[PDB]
Design a protein around this ligand. Structure first.
Ligand code: L9Q
Ligand code: D12
Ligand code: D12
Ligand code: D12
Ligand code: D12
Ligand code: D12
Ligand code: D12
Ligand code: D12
Ligand code: D12
Ligand code: D12
Lengths: 21, 75, 96, 264, 145, 20, 49, 48, 21
């Protein structure tokens, strides 16, 4: 049950894994 | 029209649209629109005098160019 | 007529895929300069490095005369200069 | 005379000022994309068109950074004629029709730049204007494009009037890029704050972690799978079409060539 | 630790050389960056980047494109295997009888089958001195067995 | 000179003197 | 707008039937498209010759 | 990072107005911020 | 018109792009 809030969270945090924060 | 037909057909008006109409003091002119109508009519006439089995995308061209003329006549 | 294969692998995808891979890796190689150039402006933008070369050359001089006790001592200075960025600023001041 | 008047009123004039470079470049990016995709004499043609899109984009950047309306006029005139003459060199198509269409949009937005003018404030990355989440993602994507970041830097340096060298220009660009990314993240954390001490949301963890694991699986296992799959396919029936039994007997003249073929 | 002192020294030397040259030849305060210098370095970098992407493609295409070596049947071996038991009728010919069709000859064949598009296409696409003439011998002498 | 003026930064620049 | 749908037919009658009469139809359209808005309000009853 | 982006954007502003003397001066600030980690801590403080 | 002064400048600055200063 991936919510849109979760979906942005996931995306942003993978971006933080590569890019800063 | 230049995407449906090629060579002497088009490649005169599209060039002029990019180099005269869109590169002008505000509204193109009157001579641009006149030459557009004239060229489209000439093209129609010579394609009718035969290129064979001529296409008429110049119908919708001439009529749109005369619609704009009416819009700018009313101002 | 006959067609001589001047490809080797596969012009359609083998060589093509290799080319793409090369481009990407060369991409990363070139990024390797213009990505973290700012993480060194503390070890590369020193105004006057004269005092640090003296230290370095003193280590060399003390190894030729084989007084290796002072080698350890002068190495300690070198590593503390490079362990505290603020002391590098002090030591690399243009005039004094 | 009339031509001179047209050009005078396209240069001196009394018009406004807009920055449509972003959109012009986007049109050219789409053009590049469809020409790259349109590899389908043809490879040579597509390779020349590649070099072309590229060279024209570089020239455009020059004129934008040097704010040259006269230069843009010249470029536009030349490019219009040349692209229209390239329609005659069709000898190496939906791809080409679309390339023409998107180049027409570029010519329209370029014509607009010339007839409007160049605005005073031209510097500043398009995707660093606002500090949201979309700007963040777009900027990071631009940085992920193989050589766009570095090309932008070097190019801009060459045109923009600076006192600094390339090394130092690249320093300020790196600092700015990193600072922007941090700012976007800070802004989003102020917009949507996360309670103090609130786990990390099971789902978020499962997603990112899962993706990473799967990517690692595809580094080791997937190649092996693909390799084995392709190599395993072996075995095409090969049957002797004919049975040629030449019972070479006579040492001097070997004979006994009674033999058969496929029917038998 | 030996490598540490070597790295430090190397970097320090490079910095010193640059500092010394800036003292020897000072650059006025706020003096652009010299258009030519910029054009040179920038240009080289751009060209190097061009040669990362475009040049390989060019080289690749150039080599691969070269294709096409004329292959003409040296002989026309028509063995009209007739008898089921003993296939014979091997009257056939070789290069002397085989005629590599000339340019004019090719035009003739192409025009003969010009009405049919694909027929002409076959002939025309095949390069001149490609289409060979099957002048198979029909005379016997070889009795059969 | 460019060199000396780009290597002139000190701590006094970063003091909080009404930085608006 | 009927004055004008007729102008469309005038054009297309020429186009379809490729002849000399067709060229004349084409011309009749070209003309009454140019000099046409004038006589759409001046030929309403005033001499529709 | 607000105070650092101001510095960065001031360098950009000073290059558009072509007052390149101040470009050199503002670059000096940028490099000293990144040459002393302690001043970065001071300049990047959350509130003041 | 690349002068010798420009030529050394160019060379040194490409060296600075790779090596320090
Ligand atoms: C909008 C669409 C975005 C995709 C465009 C086309 C995709 C092209 C390739 C994109 C792949 C994305 C992977 C990014 C991985 C992050 C690493 C990175 O440096 O990403 C860099 C950009 O570098 C690139 O050019 C991206 C390609 C990296 C190569 C990885 C691809 C794997 C395939 C090759 C495998 C071998 C890996 C390399 C071998 C040895 C290399 C020395 C971004 O940090 P940054 O410093 O500017 O950060 C600023 C502050 N840290
Ligand atoms: C929000 C997209 C899912 C997380 C990103 C994974 C990479 C793409 C896989 C599926 C694309 C929708
Ligand atoms: C379809 C599986 C991944 C293919 C490429 C998607 C890239 C993932 C992006 C991760 C966060 C946006
Ligand atoms: C081919 C397009 C897919 C994008 C390539 C990978 C992008 C995500 C990988 C790592 C995230 C920064
Ligand atoms: C991953 C950095 C944000 C950029 C957004 C798109 C980049 C490619 C990821 C997914 C492509 C299929
Ligand atoms: C960082 C790992 C996230 C998933 C991989 C992103 C897409 C890159 C393409 C590699 C194939 C899985
Ligand atoms: C840093 C870019 C300058 C030009 C490249 C230097 C020579 C390296 C060989 C690569 C072929 C262009
Ligand atoms: C001073 C040499 C020109 C700049 C260096 C470029 C790489 C060599 C190309 C021509 C060698 C003379
Ligand atoms: C002939 C083009 C480059 C080949 C190798 C030259 C190396 C360039 C050096 C850049 C500054 C010295
Ligand atoms: C084969 C000899 C040419 C030298 C190789 C490249 C040297 C210059 C490239 C980058 C400059 C540091």
């Amino acid at each position: 049950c991936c919510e849109s809030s979760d979906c942005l969270e996931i995306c942003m945090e993978c971006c933080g894994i590569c890019f800063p924060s | 029209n230049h995407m449906v037909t090629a060579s002497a057909g088009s490649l005169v008006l599209p060039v002029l649209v990019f180099l005269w109409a869109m590169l002008s003091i505000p509204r193109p002119s009157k001579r641009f629109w006149m030459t557009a109508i004239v060229f489209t009519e000439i093209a129609v006439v010579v394609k009718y005098l035969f290129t064979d089995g001529y296409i008429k995308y110049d119908l919708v061209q001439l009529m749109a160019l005369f619609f704009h003329r009416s819009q700018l006549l009313c101002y | 007529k006959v067609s001589p294969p001047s490809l080797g692998f596969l012009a359609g995808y083998g060589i093509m895929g290799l080319y793409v891979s090369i481009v990407l890796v060369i991409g990363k190689f070139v990024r390797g300069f213009f990505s973290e150039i700012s993480h060194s402006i503390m070890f590369e933008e020193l105004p006057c490095v004269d005092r640090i070369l003296k230290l370095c050359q003193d280590i060399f001089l003390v190894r030729e005369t084989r007084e290796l006790e002072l080698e350890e001592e002068l190495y300690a200075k070198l590593i503390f200069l490079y362990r505290s960025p603020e002391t590098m600023i002090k030591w690399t001041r243009e005039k004094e | 005379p009339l031509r001179r008047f047209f050009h005078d009123i396209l240069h001196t004039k009394y018009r406004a000022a807009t920055d449509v470079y972003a959109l012009m470049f986007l049109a050219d990016v789409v053009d590049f994309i469809i020409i790259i995709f349109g590899f389908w004499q043809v490879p040579e043609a597509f390779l020349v068109m590649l070099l072309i899109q590229f060279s024209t984009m570089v020239v455009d950047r020059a004129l934008y950074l040097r704010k040259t309306v006269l230069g843009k006029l010249a470029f536009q005139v030349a490019l219009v004629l040349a692209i229209h003459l390239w329609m005659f060199f069709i000898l190496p198509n939906v791809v080409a029709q679309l390339w023409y269409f998107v180049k027409c949009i570029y010519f329209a937005l370029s014509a607009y730049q010339i007839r409007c003018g160049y605005p005073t404030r031209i510097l500043g990355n398009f995707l660093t204007k606002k500090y949201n989440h979309l700007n963040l993602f777009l900027f990071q994507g631009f940085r992920l494009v193989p050589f766009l970041v570095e090309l932008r830097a070097v190019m801009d340096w060459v045109w923009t009037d600076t006192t600094l060298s390339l090394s130092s220009w690249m320093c300020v660009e790196d600092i700015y890029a990193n600072i922007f990314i941090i700012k976007c993240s800070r802004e989003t954390e102020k917009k949507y704050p996360q309670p103090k001490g609130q786990k990390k949301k099971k789902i978020v963890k499962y997603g990112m972690g899962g993706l990473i694991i799967l990517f690692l699986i595809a580094i080791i296992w997937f190649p092996l799978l693909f390799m084995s799959l392709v190599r395993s396919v072996v075995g095409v029936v090969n049957q002797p079409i004919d049975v040629t039994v030449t019972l070479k007997l006579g040492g001097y003249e070997p004979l006994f060539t009674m033999s058969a073929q496929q029917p038998s | 630790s030996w490598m540490c002192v070597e790295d430090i020294y190397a970097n320090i030397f490079i910095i010193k050389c640059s500092r010394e040259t800036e003292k020897k030849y000072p650059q006025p305060k706020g003096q652009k960056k010299k258009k030519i210098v910029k054009y040179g370095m920038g240009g080289l970098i751009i060209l190097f980047l061009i040669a990362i992407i475009w040049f390989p493609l060019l080289f690749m295409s150039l080599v691969r494109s070269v294709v096409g070596v004329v292959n003409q049947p040296i002989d026309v071996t028509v063995t009209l295997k007739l008898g089921g038991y003993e296939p014979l009728f091997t009257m056939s010919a070789q290069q002397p009888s085989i005629i590599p069709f000339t340019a004019q000859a090719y035009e003739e064949l192409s025009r003969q089958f010009d009405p049919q598009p694909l027929a002409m296409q076959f002939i025309s696409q095949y390069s001149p001195e490609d289409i060979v003439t099957a002048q198979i011998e029909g005379s016997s002498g070889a009795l059969w067995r | 000179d460019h060199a000396t003026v780009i290597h002139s930064g000190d701590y006094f620049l970063f003091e909080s003197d009404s930085e608006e | 707008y009927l004055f004008w749908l007729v102008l469309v037919v005038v054009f297309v009658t020429g186009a379809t039937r490729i002849s000399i009469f067709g060229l004349g139809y084409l011309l009749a359209c070209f003309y009454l498209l140019l000099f046409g808005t004038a006589l759409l309000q001046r030929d309403t009853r005033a001499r529709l010759v």
